[PDB]
Design an enzyme around this catalytic site. Structure first.
Site, PDB file in Angstrom:
ATOM      1  N   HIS A 244      33.680  41.718  21.084  1.00  0.00           N
ATOM      2  CA  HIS A 244      33.683  42.752  20.058  1.00  0.00           C
ATOM      3  C   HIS A 244      33.074  44.039  20.604  1.00  0.00           C
ATOM      4  O   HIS A 244      33.796  44.922  21.069  1.00  0.00           O
ATOM      5  CB  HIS A 244      32.916  42.282  18.813  1.00  0.00           C
ATOM      6  CG  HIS A 244      31.674  41.502  19.117  1.00  0.00           C
ATOM      7  ND1 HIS A 244      31.701  40.180  19.506  1.00  0.00           N
ATOM      8  CD2 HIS A 244      30.366  41.852  19.066  1.00  0.00           C
ATOM      9  CE1 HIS A 244      30.465  39.748  19.680  1.00  0.00           C
ATOM     10  NE2 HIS A 244      29.635  40.744  19.419  1.00  0.00           N
TER      11      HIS A 244
ATOM     12  N   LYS B 273      43.940  42.559  19.559  1.00  0.00           N
ATOM     13  CA  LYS B 273      42.969  43.571  19.187  1.00  0.00           C
ATOM     14  C   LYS B 273      43.061  43.791  17.683  1.00  0.00           C
ATOM     15  O   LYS B 273      44.145  43.993  17.143  1.00  0.00           O
ATOM     16  CB  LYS B 273      43.256  44.875  19.940  1.00  0.00           C
ATOM     17  CG  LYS B 273      42.117  45.871  19.904  1.00  0.00           C
ATOM     18  CD  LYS B 273      42.242  46.884  21.031  1.00  0.00           C
ATOM     19  CE  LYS B 273      40.991  47.744  21.140  1.00  0.00           C
ATOM     20  NZ  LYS B 273      39.761  46.920  21.329  1.00  0.00           N
TER      21      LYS B 273
ATOM     22  N   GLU C 259      49.496  41.789  26.296  1.00  0.00           N
ATOM     23  CA  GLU C 259      49.572  40.845  27.411  1.00  0.00           C
ATOM     24  C   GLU C 259      48.181  40.236  27.643  1.00  0.00           C
ATOM     25  O   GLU C 259      47.205  40.963  27.824  1.00  0.00           O
ATOM     26  CB  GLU C 259      50.042  41.603  28.660  1.00  0.00           C
ATOM     27  CG  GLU C 259      50.094  40.811  29.949  1.00  0.00           C
ATOM     28  CD  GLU C 259      50.564  41.660  31.121  1.00  0.00           C
ATOM     29  OE1 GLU C 259      50.707  42.890  30.947  1.00  0.00           O
ATOM     30  OE2 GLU C 259      50.792  41.103  32.216  1.00  0.00           O
ATOM     31  N   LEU C 260      48.092  38.907  27.622  1.00  0.00           N
ATOM     32  CA  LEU C 260      46.817  38.229  27.856  1.00  0.00           C
ATOM     33  C   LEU C 260      46.483  38.220  29.342  1.00  0.00           C
ATOM     34  O   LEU C 260      47.183  37.603  30.139  1.00  0.00           O
ATOM     35  CB  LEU C 260      46.872  36.786  27.345  1.00  0.00           C
ATOM     36  CG  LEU C 260      45.584  35.984  27.561  1.00  0.00           C
ATOM     37  CD1 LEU C 260      44.453  36.624  26.774  1.00  0.00           C
ATOM     38  CD2 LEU C 260      45.793  34.533  27.131  1.00  0.00           C
ATOM     39  N   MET C 261      45.405  38.904  29.710  1.00  0.00           N
ATOM     40  CA  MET C 261      45.006  38.986  31.105  1.00  0.00           C
ATOM     41  C   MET C 261      43.881  38.001  31.373  1.00  0.00           C
ATOM     42  O   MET C 261      42.707  38.295  31.141  1.00  0.00           O
ATOM     43  CB  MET C 261      44.575  40.419  31.434  1.00  0.00           C
ATOM     44  CG  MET C 261      45.683  41.440  31.205  1.00  0.00           C
ATOM     45  SD  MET C 261      47.022  41.347  32.429  1.00  0.00           S
ATOM     46  CE  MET C 261      47.803  39.766  32.060  1.00  0.00           C
TER      47      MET C 261
ATOM     48  N   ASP D 221      39.512  58.125  31.777  1.00  0.00           N
ATOM     49  CA  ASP D 221      38.428  57.168  31.981  1.00  0.00           C
ATOM     50  C   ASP D 221      38.818  56.001  32.876  1.00  0.00           C
ATOM     51  O   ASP D 221      38.665  54.836  32.502  1.00  0.00           O
ATOM     52  CB  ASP D 221      37.917  56.635  30.640  1.00  0.00           C
ATOM     53  CG  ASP D 221      36.566  55.935  30.765  1.00  0.00           C
ATOM     54  OD1 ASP D 221      35.911  56.072  31.820  1.00  0.00           O
ATOM     55  OD2 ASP D 221      36.159  55.250  29.808  1.00  0.00           O
TER      56      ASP D 221
ATOM     57  N   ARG E  63      35.596  48.884  34.057  1.00  0.00           N
ATOM     58  CA  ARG E  63      35.500  48.266  32.737  1.00  0.00           C
ATOM     59  C   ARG E  63      36.822  48.344  31.970  1.00  0.00           C
ATOM     60  O   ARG E  63      37.036  47.598  31.017  1.00  0.00           O
ATOM     61  CB  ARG E  63      34.398  48.946  31.912  1.00  0.00           C
ATOM     62  CG  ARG E  63      34.752  50.372  31.520  1.00  0.00           C
ATOM     63  CD  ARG E  63      33.669  51.071  30.713  1.00  0.00           C
ATOM     64  NE  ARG E  63      33.825  52.520  30.821  1.00  0.00           N
ATOM     65  CZ  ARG E  63      33.300  53.244  31.806  1.00  0.00           C
ATOM     66  NH1 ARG E  63      32.578  52.650  32.748  1.00  0.00           N
ATOM     67  NH2 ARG E  63      33.524  54.550  31.878  1.00  0.00           N
ATOM     68  N   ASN E  64      37.703  49.254  32.386  1.00  0.00           N
ATOM     69  CA  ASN E  64      38.960  49.484  31.681  1.00  0.00           C
ATOM     70  C   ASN E  64      40.159  48.865  32.391  1.00  0.00           C
ATOM     71  O   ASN E  64      41.304  49.098  32.003  1.00  0.00           O
ATOM     72  CB  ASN E  64      39.185  50.990  31.491  1.00  0.00           C
ATOM     73  CG  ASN E  64      38.201  51.594  30.517  1.00  0.00           C
ATOM     74  OD1 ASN E  64      37.791  50.936  29.562  1.00  0.00           O
ATOM     75  ND2 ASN E  64      37.807  52.844  30.752  1.00  0.00           N
TER      76      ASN E  64
ATOM     77  N   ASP F  99      42.864  49.628  28.976  1.00  0.00           N
ATOM     78  CA  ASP F  99      42.311  50.350  27.833  1.00  0.00           C
ATOM     79  C   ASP F  99      42.651  51.831  27.940  1.00  0.00           C
ATOM     80  O   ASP F  99      42.580  52.410  29.022  1.00  0.00           O
ATOM     81  CB  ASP F  99      40.788  50.190  27.784  1.00  0.00           C
ATOM     82  CG  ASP F  99      40.160  50.927  26.607  1.00  0.00           C
ATOM     83  OD1 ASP F  99      39.953  52.159  26.696  1.00  0.00           O
ATOM     84  OD2 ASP F  99      39.871  50.270  25.589  1.00  0.00           O
TER      85      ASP F  99
HETATM   86  C1  LIG Z   1      36.166  42.109  25.814  1.00  0.00           C
HETATM   87  N1  LIG Z   1      37.070  42.975  26.547  1.00  0.00           N
HETATM   88  C2  LIG Z   1      38.062  43.729  25.921  1.00  0.00           C
HETATM   89  O1  LIG Z   1      38.275  43.748  24.709  1.00  0.00           O
HETATM   90  C3  LIG Z   1      38.908  44.588  26.831  1.00  0.00           C
HETATM   91  C4  LIG Z   1      38.220  45.341  27.842  1.00  0.00           C
HETATM   92  C5  LIG Z   1      38.936  46.179  28.732  1.00  0.00           C
HETATM   93  C6  LIG Z   1      40.340  46.273  28.621  1.00  0.00           C
HETATM   94  F1  LIG Z   1      41.014  47.064  29.462  1.00  0.00           F
HETATM   95  C7  LIG Z   1      41.051  45.545  27.638  1.00  0.00           C
HETATM   96  C8  LIG Z   1      40.358  44.680  26.715  1.00  0.00           C
HETATM   97  C9  LIG Z   1      41.168  43.907  25.660  1.00  0.00           C
HETATM   98  C10 LIG Z   1      41.556  44.815  24.481  1.00  0.00           C
HETATM   99  O2  LIG Z   1      42.421  43.367  26.153  1.00  0.00           O
HETATM  100  C11 LIG Z   1      42.402  42.209  26.929  1.00  0.00           C
HETATM  101  N2  LIG Z   1      41.225  41.581  27.254  1.00  0.00           N
HETATM  102  C12 LIG Z   1      41.248  40.431  28.030  1.00  0.00           C
HETATM  103  C13 LIG Z   1      39.927  39.813  28.359  1.00  0.00           C
HETATM  104  C14 LIG Z   1      38.764  40.653  28.427  1.00  0.00           C
HETATM  105  C15 LIG Z   1      37.469  40.164  28.740  1.00  0.00           C
HETATM  106  C16 LIG Z   1      37.347  38.798  28.988  1.00  0.00           C
HETATM  107  N3  LIG Z   1      38.405  37.930  28.944  1.00  0.00           N
HETATM  108  C17 LIG Z   1      39.669  38.425  28.637  1.00  0.00           C
HETATM  109  O3  LIG Z   1      40.742  37.537  28.597  1.00  0.00           O
HETATM  110  C18 LIG Z   1      40.459  36.159  28.890  1.00  0.00           C
HETATM  111  C19 LIG Z   1      42.495  39.950  28.455  1.00  0.00           C
HETATM  112  N4  LIG Z   1      43.676  40.573  28.131  1.00  0.00           N
HETATM  113  C20 LIG Z   1      43.643  41.713  27.367  1.00  0.00           C
HETATM  114  N5  LIG Z   1      44.843  42.358  27.036  1.00  0.00           N
END
Ligand SMILES: CNC(=O)c1ccc(F)cc1[C@@H](C)Oc1nc(-c2cccnc2OC)cnc1N
Length: 295
Positions: free
Chosen positions: A32, A50, A97-99, A149, A153-154, A170
């Site tokens: 969050h 999201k 897309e799940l990363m 940015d 982190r992004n 992001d």
């Molecule tokens: C908490 N991070 C975010 O929300 C975050 C931070 C930076 C960013 F570019 C995108 C996001 C969110 C929107 O999108 C995603 N997060 C994860 C993911 C992120 C962190 C840990 N495990 C994960 O997948 C297993 C995996 N796939 C995404 N499409």
């Protein structure tokens, strides 16, 4: 409903792929922190979900709608895909897309070579991540989109393992500018003309990419160790630059120092950056350099 223009094409909320809410299942939380929670989900197609807090303002709503438009209009392998949205039910969803590898900053820190994992990461792994993001940046550049940015982190990774692909994940800063405060601005990733005159060009992202490169080869350290935002601002404005990360090959450091040229016209575009990253990956003296092992 606000319109969005990218690459001279206009799009509306009507252009977003609405996925029926019944087809979407939440599995687990992922985070969050920043405004809005993110979940792992299914639509079986796996997604990151999201969410928009139901307790939000009109502007929060418009912001959410705009990031949906922004991401859905990109088409590139190094930018996270948008599967669709669910805006006709509450809370509203954007489906990405799940990363599975998570974010790049956390990955670098978690995956640093250790006595237990002596070969968890090599110079080539880092160079491939850098190339991947530079490819995404080149796409944004050639389509005249300024990210504002570019930072670890992004960025996200498709998987923890060796075949991982890095993507920009992001676009919240760009969304805000398209339509906050000093203390939230990513000053440690910004060139002098950006935080002084508020002037942004594609050369803004070049400077930021330099800082990302430092993040990558430092294995996830915060830029400008020990310096506060204002100290960095004054340091960079006076010509100060970061030292090489530990064990960083000279050719790689030189890419950083070129990204940090004071005059934006003296900084390379991303075509040149990619050329230089490629040359580094071919150079045995670069890729045979061992990363530090953290005790
Ligand atoms: C908490 N991070 C975010 O929300 C975050 C931070 C930076 C960013 F570019 C995108 C996001 C969110 C929107 O999108 C995603 N997060 C994860 C993911 C992120 C962190 C840990 N495990 C994960 O997948 C297993 C995996 N796939 C995404 N499409």
């Amino acid at each position: 409903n606000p319109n969005y223009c990218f690459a001279g094409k206009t799009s509306s909320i009507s252009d977003l792929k609405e996925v029926p809410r019944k087809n979407i299942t939440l599995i687990r939380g992922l985070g969050h922190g920043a405004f809005g929670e993110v979940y792992e989900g299914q639509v079986p197609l796996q997604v990151a979900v999201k969410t928009l807090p139901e307790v939000c303002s009109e502007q929060d709503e418009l912001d959410f709608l705009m990031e949906a438009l922004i991401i859905s209009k990109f088409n590139h392998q190094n930018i996270v895909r948008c599967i669709g949205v669910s805006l006709q039910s509450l809370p509203r969803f954007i489906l990405l897309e799940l990363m599975a590898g998570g974010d790049l900053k956390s990955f670098l820190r978690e995956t640093r070579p250790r006595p237990s994992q002596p070969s968890s990461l090599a110079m080539l792994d880092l160079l491939h991540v850098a190339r991947d993001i530079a490819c995404g940046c080149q796409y944004l550049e050639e389509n005249h989109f300024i990210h504002r940015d570019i930072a670890a982190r992004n960025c996200l990774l498709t998987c923890p393992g060796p075949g991982r692909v890095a993507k920009i994940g992001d676009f919240g800063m760009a969304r805000d500018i398209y339509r906050g405060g000093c203390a939230m601005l990513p000053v440690k990733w910004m060139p002098p003309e950006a935080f002084m005159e508020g002037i942004f060009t594609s050369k803004t992202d070049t400077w930021s990419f330099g800082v990302l490169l430092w993040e990558i080869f430092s294995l996830g350290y915060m830029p400008y160790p020990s310096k506060s935002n204002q100290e960095v601002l004054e340091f960079v404005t006076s010509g100060g630059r970061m030292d090489p990360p530990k064990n960083c090959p000279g050719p790689v450091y030189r890419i950083m120092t070129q990204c940090w040229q004071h005059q934006p016209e003296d900084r390379p575009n991303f075509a040149i950056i990619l050329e230089r990253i490629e040359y580094c990956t071919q150079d045995p003296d670069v890729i045979n350099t061992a990363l530090p092992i953290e005790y």
